[PDB]
Amino acid sequence: GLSDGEWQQVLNVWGKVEADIAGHGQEVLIRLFTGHPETLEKFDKFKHLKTEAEMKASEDLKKHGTVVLTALGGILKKKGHHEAELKPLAQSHATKHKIPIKYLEFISDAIIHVLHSKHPGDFGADAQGAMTKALELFRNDIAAKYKELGFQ
Numbered sequence: 001g002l003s004d005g006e007w008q009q010v011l012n013v014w015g016k017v018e019a020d021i022a023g024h025g026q027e028v029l030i031r032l033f034t035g036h037p038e039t040l041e042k043f044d045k046f047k048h049l050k051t052e053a054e055m056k057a058s059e060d061l062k063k064h065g066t067v068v069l070t071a072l073g074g075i076l077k078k079k080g081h082h083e084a085e086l087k088p089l090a091q092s093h094a095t096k097h098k099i100p101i102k103y104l105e106f107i108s109d110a111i112i113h114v115l116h117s118k119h120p121g122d123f124g125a126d127a128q129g130a131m132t133k134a135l136e137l138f139r140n141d142i143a144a145k146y147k148e149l150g151f152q
C-alpha cells in the first residue's frame with residue numbers, strides 16, 4: 001500500500017527508465033544473470049551465454065529486457081490496481097516458466113542496483129523507498145497467486 005506521494009515518486013523514477021527502456025532492461029537482466037547464475041538456467045534462449053561480453057552483445061537479451069520492463073511499467077502505472085495485468089504474469093511464471101518467488105526478489109533488488117548505477121546521485125532516498133515499496137507490492141501480489149496455485 002502506497003500513498004499518492006509515493007506513487008508520484010515511483011512514476012517520476014520510471015520516467016528515467018522510459019527514456020532508455022532497452023538499456024535499462026539489458027542491464028537489469030545482466031545484473032540478475034551475473035549475480036545469480038542459476039537464474040540463467042530458466043531461460044532456454046539465454047543459457048548459451050557464458051560471458052558477460054556475450055550477454056552485452058546479445059540483441060535478443062536487450063529485446064527481452066524491453067518486454068520485461070514494458071510489462072512492469074504497465075503494472076506500475078496502475079498504482080496498485082493491477083489485478084488484471086498481474087494475473088497472467090503470475091500464472092505464466094508459476095506454471096510455465098517455474099520461477100520461484102526468490103528470483104522475483106533477486107530481480108527487484110537488481111532494479112534498485114541498476115537505477116543507482118545509471119543515475120548516481122539522482123536516485124534519492126525517498127525515491128528508493130517508494131520504488132522498493134512498489135516492487136514489494138508487486139512481489140506480494142504475485143506471492144498470493146503462487147500460494148493459490150501451490151507453487152514453490
Ligand code: HEM
Nearest residue numbers: 039042043044045067068071072089092097099103104107
Ligand atoms: C519484474 C519481473 C518480471 C516481469 C515483469 C516479467 C515479465 C515477463 C514477460 C512479459 C514475459 C513474456 C510473456 C510471458 O511468458 O508471460 C516473460 C517471460 C519469461 N520470464 Fe519473466 N518477468 C519477470 C521476472 C522473471 C524472472 C525473475 C525470471 C527468471 C529468473 C523470469 C523468467 C521468464 C522466462 C524464462 C520467460 C520466457 C522467456 C522466453 O523463452 O521467451 N521472469 N517475463
